[PDB]
Amino acid sequence: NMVNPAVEPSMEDDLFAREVAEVKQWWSDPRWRYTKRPFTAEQIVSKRGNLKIEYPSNAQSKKLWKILEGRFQKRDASYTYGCLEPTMVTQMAKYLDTVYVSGWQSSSTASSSDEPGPDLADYPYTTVPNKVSHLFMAQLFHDRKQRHERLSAPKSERSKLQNIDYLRPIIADADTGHGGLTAVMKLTKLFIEKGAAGIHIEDQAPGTKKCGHMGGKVLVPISEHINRLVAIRAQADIMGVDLLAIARTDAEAATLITTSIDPRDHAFILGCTNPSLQPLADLMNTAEQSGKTGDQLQAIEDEWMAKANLKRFDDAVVDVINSSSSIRNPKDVAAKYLQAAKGKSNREARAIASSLGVPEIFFDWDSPRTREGYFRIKGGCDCAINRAIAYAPYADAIWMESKLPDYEQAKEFAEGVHAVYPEQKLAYNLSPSFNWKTAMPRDEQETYIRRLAGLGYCWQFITLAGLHTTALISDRFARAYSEVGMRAYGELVQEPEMELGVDVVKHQKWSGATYVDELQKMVTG
Amino acid sequence: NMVNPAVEPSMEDDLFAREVAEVKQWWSDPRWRYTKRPFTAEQIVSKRGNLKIEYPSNAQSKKLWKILEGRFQKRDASYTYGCLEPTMVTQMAKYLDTVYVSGWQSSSTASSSDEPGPDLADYPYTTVPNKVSHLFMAQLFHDRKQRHERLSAPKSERSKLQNIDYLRPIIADADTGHGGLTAVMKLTKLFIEKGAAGIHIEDQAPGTKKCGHMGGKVLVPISEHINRLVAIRAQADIMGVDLLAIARTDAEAATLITTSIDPRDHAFILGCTNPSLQPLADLMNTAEQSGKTGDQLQAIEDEWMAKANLKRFDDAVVDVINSSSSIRNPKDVAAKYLQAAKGKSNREARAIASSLGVPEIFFDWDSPRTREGYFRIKGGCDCAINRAIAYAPYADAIWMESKLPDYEQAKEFAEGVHAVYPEQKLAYNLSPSFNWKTAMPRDEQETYIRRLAGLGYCWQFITLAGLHTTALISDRFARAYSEVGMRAYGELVQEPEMELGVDVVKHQKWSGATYVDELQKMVT
Amino acid sequence: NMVNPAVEPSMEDDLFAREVAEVKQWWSDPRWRYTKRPFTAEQIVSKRGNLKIEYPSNAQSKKLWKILEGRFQKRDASYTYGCLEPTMVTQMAKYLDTVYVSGWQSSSTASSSDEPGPDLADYPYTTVPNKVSHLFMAQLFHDRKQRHERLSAPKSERSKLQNIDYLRPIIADADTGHGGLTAVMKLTKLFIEKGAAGIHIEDQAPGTKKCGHMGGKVLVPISEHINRLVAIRAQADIMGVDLLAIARTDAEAATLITTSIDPRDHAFILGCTNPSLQPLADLMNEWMAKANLKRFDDAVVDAKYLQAAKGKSNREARAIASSFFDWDSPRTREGYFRIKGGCDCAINRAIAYAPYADAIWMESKLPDYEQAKEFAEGVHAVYPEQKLAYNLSPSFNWKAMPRDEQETYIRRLAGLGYCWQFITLAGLHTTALISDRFARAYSEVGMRAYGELVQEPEMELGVDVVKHQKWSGATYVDELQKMVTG
Amino acid sequence: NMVNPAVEPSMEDDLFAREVAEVKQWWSDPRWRYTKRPFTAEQIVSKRGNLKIEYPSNAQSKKLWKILEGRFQKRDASYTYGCLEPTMVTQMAKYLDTVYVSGWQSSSTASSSDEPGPDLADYPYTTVPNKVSHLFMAQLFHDRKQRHERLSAPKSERSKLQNIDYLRPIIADADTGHGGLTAVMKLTKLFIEKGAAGIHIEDQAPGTKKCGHMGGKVLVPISEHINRLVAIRAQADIMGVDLLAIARTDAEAATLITTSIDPRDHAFILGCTNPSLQPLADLMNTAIEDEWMAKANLKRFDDAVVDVINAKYLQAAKGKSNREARAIASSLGVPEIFFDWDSPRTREGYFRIKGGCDCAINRAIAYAPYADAIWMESKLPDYEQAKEFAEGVHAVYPEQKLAYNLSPSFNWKTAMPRDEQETYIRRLAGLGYCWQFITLAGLHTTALISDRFARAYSEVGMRAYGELVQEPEMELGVDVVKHQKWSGATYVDELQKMV
Ligand SMILES: [Mg+2]
Ligand SMILES: [Mg+2]
Ligand SMILES: [Mg+2]
Ligand SMILES: [Mg+2]
């Protein structure tokens, strides 16, 4: 009949050991020399099914890895930008060796539910993985098309034909993982199934995520983001692919953090140094239960914050030492304090301060909590480096959002991470949020990427360039077209296309009309 | 107890009666003064369910209808181009009053399966409606975004704020219908559900459909395309909306037709006039059943075709008249034959030539059929005019593809149609497949749309302008960007956006970040 | 020249005022007599666009409202179960007046990405709203099919035909909202556009959400769940629909809470009473029993201060006392707090959610009538006309109740005010049962099993689907065709 | 910088050559011994891209082939039925080695647009492949879940656990290809990407696709359907997979055909033998049809030739084009026969044909070289007819696998005695019908239990759930009764603990 087991019991153990050995051998590849796996080959194989699946995503990540390995070793950089759709990706393939898929661009132009909006990662998590597939399936198509044209013409005739590399690895945005760890693994699975060569996940909290240059970004504990990076690697291992994992931190300008449970975040959590105040939350509640609204509540909250005199604990300590009237050598004590207290938890920092003769210090990080229950933090490059260093073992590349295209801070960040992991690859957001004309003169704009590459930033990208380029020409053309009709098409579009040799100008051929026509003749012939 | 009927059997008839009355009242509206409906209000209402649904697409078509009514009457035109995605649509809204969604563009950039390819209408049929929805949901969002910013500001400060009309009616490509009449109705249903103000369907056959300017187009019989147009209207009626139905004919350049069953197509079907030849099918068969396969079989067909001496029937008749000594008045016989046989079936035409004393005409349009069984046909503007006239009662606007931006032929096509229906709106494809620099000087390029508007082409569009504009800026920026890094971004993109005052340059605000933040606060 | 404003400047204020007036008029309807809106009609309108859209969803929620108003007032109840797909829905339509779309069933049979998994609300949030569309579009189709049949047939023969009400209002699972408040509004927008008559949202946290009868369920603060419920009403108001919002609380068996920020939650947060103990988190590198966790009151009562401490924060609670409690040490690794759930806790939460919910549901460990009575009475002691909903969970082992009590359970709960009841996974279970039974028999005796276990039974019960072609709408579509070419 | 070619010009030729070699090697495998490929390996490779992709569809394809090969050789059969969704597929997996995905069922319950309707193949063509993915992703998940459970337990205890083969090969409905040849290859590409082990395609016309037992089905020419089967194999070859291609013919009951261009169709096309009549179209336009039809005295050519005579004609006229048949008939003294198959045409332009089993055998034999299995859509469960069809096809291709659709509509209660009902499948398998299926069983079982339960539930409430659902599940040991474990809660909980 039709009854049979998935696997004959007699062979279950054999197949398991054999597969386990294969994974341990795989993990030995140089690809993983910087990767820390807090789990065993046995644990991973034990989660796999009986049918091994191969993914073209794997090939692309291997390709991407070969590229970034070179770039970093030579202190050069591969740079690209956020691609919106297929037309754009086929043109980018001629000059850029990678492709970036922006979640910001996806919210405004590719939500799988078609409901657009600001960059809040609040679209269905199928969104970015579907954009990857949208571009990848188009890349695979134009590759087949072109190979067909090339192999179809006499060898001596090929020098005239194009030879574009359409299979440019795609790095996609995973936002914060769209939920818990089980969601992170499912998202990663889609990304691999859809073709991503690599993905990036940020240490922000889902439900509140904002674009890197917004005020009020909320972070998650360092341990939680590490879990996310581990979950991604675990899912990739289960699927047997080399998907690159990129860690992004928003600790530079972040002002909030979900919990203070992780001692590594203690040094940066703001505490109320005023013993007389009642909790902000209590104050704010009473304020609302009294009709206070808008600017009132704000004023009431603003005053509380000021009287609170919020500071990181080390600052609270240094201020006490310097204001003292009994402590001998304030500079010496403060100096010894800061040195020993670095990276210590709050309890240990307090213990250190007391051992150095400083009196007890009032420091309360609960009273300043927001109505949601979040804690306030004073981030910055130092906070960013701390996090990057902690993520490093679980990240193939690290990225830190910044406020301006500041070379020095990029240097500061890089040297900070490299002090611990000299070979850690770095990625950088050449954000269009920065007013580049105001930020730096042309000559420096022209060398910025190169200068950053010298620092280890081997992969750089202009997040929203696709959006802006499409908007600019659309605004320009639609206007001209409305003013002078077809004169605008020939002048602003068709002629420039010819002069530049844009292959799309010959739309029929560019679309694969001949390619499919030959597929047809082959079947009917 | 949870058992109850959908509707009380006692009131079923009263409700049906009232609905029918409404449908009839709706049909008397001037919106339908040119519309021929081969079915009754009772038939339509009998296909409806018990829960009436209203679609924003209906509002969009009414808006479209008002716009096109105005243009045609003033002999002006609204013109737009094929929009690729949301970023593009929000910019078009500033200068263009309508939006076009191309099936061609959808093939290379928007198939529902993500499998791209050439314009063959072979992607899943949800492809174009989904693109309509993609753009329509974005327009809706941006209209919300802008109203909030405007209403949130003091009346006195609004003059400084943008006042873009994002709700530009969308006209979509329904290809040939993606299957039979039931497929046509399902397609129209999704278009209506996705926000389409109008859709266009062409007289090519699905499966062999292709680019409007590609050689070898295959036509379906006139009756078939009319059925499609009627199917569209019926579905719109069932759903209670004013969806515009635009008919497109590919007869100007088409060389094939699927069948010879429709007498209206007989005047154009090509027949072999050499009684010594054997059917092309048998020849090619016998030929391939012995190697030769390749360019040899090709040439073998060209020769047959040459020997066949193919002609439209009227010409075959006239050729026999001018070579029959038994005919005393050849000029009179020919003229009389042409006058009477005009628009008649082959059988009627043969009966006419017969009555006029014309000898037996050897004409065989079956022998020239392709291996797929397709008949040959000589189309052209005259064939297209004939089809447009036959489609007009079931089409809100008519479109005839052309080989070149030829004003004279466009005027010829318009006159042909207006001779019978002087108020028939027309549509024109300002094709980017045409070499404009080579077609007409710049000053004439700028008057072209207006010239065409004077003829009644009240709605015109550059099918693939979105593709090309996007390709251009992408090639240019990507190249420069790979050459001078960030210098190119500020020089070619950011600074120009600033100069031009492009709202997107402040992407956060443009994306609706302020709008959602206020939604947030409202909910506290 | 194709350039024109969205709205002429001189009309904007007049259009706003009029629309704001319409909304205030709408909100005065008795449908909203229990509804508390912490926002104004003006705030809502200034969030709308210039094109009003009407949804068949609004019609269904109105029909649903009319149904539940009746059930509650008569102290009866409508009961249904989770539906899997169209075939099942066309059959349920004949006997039950509402339809339920389970998030549990959706995870195992309908993720938008096709990746199955346990009930963790970790599929793309598009999942459940799509399942609603799936069934609703099918309901609409069959409504058309049947109307065509009845209307086209001789009036004297209509009594011999079916007259099924396929338009049975659907209530769907919105899990915990799938993220932040903006996600909640987007999800609601989807449910409304897809056909939902009402949706339910629970006070668990995304990422940790588990099915009602799971172990350590984690709750969000009372205030956070209220925001979710207000976000839902807010989206419905923007869209102009009457969508029902059902509040579910998992407080009866929850053991953890994300934060202690809300004072209404203080009365249930467990704190260590052993000064000798060091933080639990530190030890994890048991402590519990030794910690002697207690609620502040069960620690203060060691006379009648409880009467003035009721519903007070810990700060205010301590104050009352004067005239050792530490809840930080017990915190989990994630930073969560320990809490003692229970009916009392659920009642407290139910009461806080009430002004923002059309119906309230409290998960229970067993189908316990007495507990259901206690919950109902606790809520009603404050909001006597608050509709309640109940999960006739297939997770329970009914034989927990004798056959005779099984038959009256729904009726008894109905007396308590549980006007809407549902078996979450009945759809999954019925399909599974018949599938196993049939596939097994079919593998043994071939077509004999089909004639005996399926075909013959269908014809005897007169299942309309047995006439597959007619059922699927073959005659309906065939007529549509003849009408177009006729 | 970042510019580089897709492939170095100095390597293209060699890679091409090596890949072309691999394809020829692949095609020499026994899997393809019965397969005719009207194209070259060089033609296929020249259509591929530079990135090779592996599909689990292929592994399943191989598995299915191994199964069917065994079945046919032993004259046994694998049989299954149309599956609706994941729940059903996990139960079917215990007792059935294959899974069928019905287009009919997909139309009433799975259109990718959610718009249901009768079986007319007019849903978006992503419908069926999407259903395949729906079931396959579910199979893959449960396979992992169970593997983890089994491996996580000590060997000595595994015999107490389930060991269901969830990876049951899925055969799916491709209708008529959903349009032209370019659509056929696209639809085939999706099926392969989605996980199909095999697909079947029928010889009806797409715009008028009807379900098997329908009134007037329209057929495409033999050559057109062969083009579809070849298009399927080509796409499979391009993708490097072993996808099974099943050819279905509706010629047993079809009454129309799009065109008379294919000579192999000539012996079945009905013609008018009445010379005094005007074409039907002309008649209809001048405005009765049945009237014309009757006065037309429609017959197949061979029959028209006979009547004329009243004759070795039938012998030499076998499988001959009309122009040949005519040439034959006359060479035997027979007078010019009046035959016109263009006058009977429908208003859509369709020709009339008299189908039947002989017509179906003809088509099946014509498709055989391009099909891994052949199926003749039939309505009545007639053992003798099935025998007639199989012997007809086997007379030419004795090792040609056959498929069979077990009528879900016909009344089996009176169709044959119970004994005969139980042996029907076994008897067909003996004829070479190595894979059989009940297209709509999934629909009916779900429909049956739903009506029964919804009714009982509305009558006795929870009592009904205990009596008709929960108790039986427990007594039958249905794993789904413990929904949490079954859904994979422990698998995911453990997955999370690992992280
Ligand atoms: Mg982002
Ligand atoms: Mg088109
Ligand atoms: Mg749930
Ligand atoms: Mg089918």
Side-chain angles (χ1 to χ4, degrees), chain D residues 176-193:
Chain D
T176 64
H178 282 268
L181 264 32
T182 57
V184 175
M185 297 183 82
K186 278 192 166 180
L187 176 56
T188 298
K189 185 164 187 285
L190 282 179
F191 273 126
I192 293 168
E193 304 177 317

Side-chain angles (χ1 to χ4, degrees), chain C residues 372-443:
Chain C
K373 184 164 176 171
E374 168 185 30
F375 179 69
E377 289 188 352
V379 168
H380 293 311
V382 171
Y383 297 115
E385 291 177 354
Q386 179 55 258
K387 304 182 174 61
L388 304 171
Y390 187 104
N391 173 185
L392 297 168
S393 190
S395 289
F396 304 147
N397 184 322
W398 304 81
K399 57 152 61 286
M401 185 171 296
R403 206 251 312 184
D404 279 60
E405 298 189 23
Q406 291 188 179
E407 193 181 319
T408 70
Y409 198 56
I410 289 170
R411 186 184 298 86
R412 285 141 64 200
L413 290 174
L416 301 175
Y418 289 105
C419 67
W420 189 61
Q421 309 178 207
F422 55 96
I423 303 170
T424 54
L425 326 176
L428 171 93
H429 287 298
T430 50
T431 313
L433 179 64
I434 194 64
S435 286
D436 183 63
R437 206 201 313 165
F438 180 58
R440 168 168 287 180
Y442 177 62
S443 70

Side-chain angles (χ1 to χ4, degrees), chain C residues 175-452:
Chain C
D175 291 304
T176 79
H178 280 271
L181 262 28
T182 65
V184 175
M185 300 189 74
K186 273 182 170 184
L187 178 54
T188 297
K189 186 167 187 291
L190 279 178
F191 272 126
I192 289 162
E193 301 169 319
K194 302 298 184 181
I199 68 177
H200 70 71
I201 195 164
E202 62 203 45
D203 54 8
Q204 287 183 246
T208 61
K209 177 283 188 303
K210 302 123 72 68
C211 70
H213 316 78
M214 219 64 267
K217 294 188 301 184
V218 184
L219 307 172
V220 292
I222 279 172
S223 182
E224 180 166 15
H225 201 57
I226 287 169
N227 290 331
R228 291 176 176 167
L229 295 171
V230 173
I232 289 181
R233 180 55 49 207
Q235 189 53 46
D237 285 333
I238 291 178
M239 299 176 80
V241 300
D242 294 3
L243 180 78
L244 275 72
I246 297 172
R248 157 172 161 174
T249 178
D250 281 283
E252 191 288 321
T255 61
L256 307 169
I257 191 175
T258 55
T259 165
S260 64
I261 201 64
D262 202 324
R264 306 121 113 173
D265 288 308
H266 290 186
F268 299 95
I269 300 177
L270 305 183
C272 169
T273 44
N274 179 68
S276 303
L277 279 186
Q278 193 69 188
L280 166 283
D282 294 312
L283 182 67
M284 302 292 107
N285 294 63
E286 328 71 6
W287 178 85
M288 221 65 86
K290 312 180 181 181
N292 232 60
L293 307 175
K294 312 176 180 183
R295 289 183 178 177
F296 193 60
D297 297 358
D298 294 305
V300 170
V301 186
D302 307 65
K304 52 183 295 183
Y305 113 109
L306 300 57
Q307 192 64 178
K310 181 192 183 61
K312 298 299 178 64
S313 62
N314 183 76
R315 187 183 179 70
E316 292 175 297
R318 285 175 180 290
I320 308 297
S322 296
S323 303
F324 182 74
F325 188 65
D326 161 46
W327 61 33
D328 290 309
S329 48
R331 285 180 295 134
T332 68
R333 175 191 282 187
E334 303 78 59
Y336 305 146
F337 299 89
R338 308 282 171 182
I339 59 176
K340 189 164 194 55
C343 199
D344 58 322
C345 182
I347 293 169
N348 185 57
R349 265 156 185 263
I351 297 183
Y353 306 149
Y356 318 97
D358 299 306
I360 300 193
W361 155 27
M362 164 189 88
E363 280 288 80
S364 64
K365 302 186 185 66
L366 281 55
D368 189 283
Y369 175 84
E370 283 312 314
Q371 177 181 255
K373 184 164 176 171
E374 168 185 30
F375 179 69
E377 289 188 352
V379 168
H380 293 311
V382 171
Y383 297 115
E385 291 177 354
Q386 179 55 258
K387 304 182 174 61
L388 304 171
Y390 187 104
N391 173 185
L392 297 168
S393 190
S395 289
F396 304 147
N397 184 322
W398 304 81
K399 57 152 61 286
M401 185 171 296
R403 206 251 312 184
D404 279 60
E405 298 189 23
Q406 291 188 179
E407 193 181 319
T408 70
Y409 198 56
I410 289 170
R411 186 184 298 86
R412 285 141 64 200
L413 290 174
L416 301 175
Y418 289 105
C419 67
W420 189 61
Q421 309 178 207
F422 55 96
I423 303 170
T424 54
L425 326 176
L428 171 93
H429 287 298
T430 50
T431 313
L433 179 64
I434 194 64
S435 286
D436 183 63
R437 206 201 313 165
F438 180 58
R440 168 168 287 180
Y442 177 62
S443 70
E444 306 167 320
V445 300
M447 298 313 288
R448 199 188 91 190
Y450 189 65
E452 187 184 309

Side-chain angles (χ1 to χ4, degrees), chain A residues 205-220:
Chain A
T208 65
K209 93 88 68 193
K210 305 183 176 305
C211 74
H213 313 293
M214 273 289 215
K217 301 189 299 176
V218 183
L219 303 178
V220 290

Side-chain angles (χ1 to χ4, degrees), chain A residues 100 103-104 119 173 175 200 202 209 248:
Chain A
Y100 176 59
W104 191 110
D119 182 43
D173 186 351
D175 290 307
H200 70 72
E202 56 198 55
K209 93 88 68 193
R248 157 183 166 170

Side-chain angles (χ1 to χ4, degrees), chain C residues 15-25 41-43 45-46:
Chain C
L15 288 171
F16 175 75
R18 182 174 307 131
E19 180 162 26
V20 157
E22 276 152 29
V23 170
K24 288 182 181 177
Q25 185 57 49
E42 289 88 342
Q43 281 176 287
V45 178
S46 65

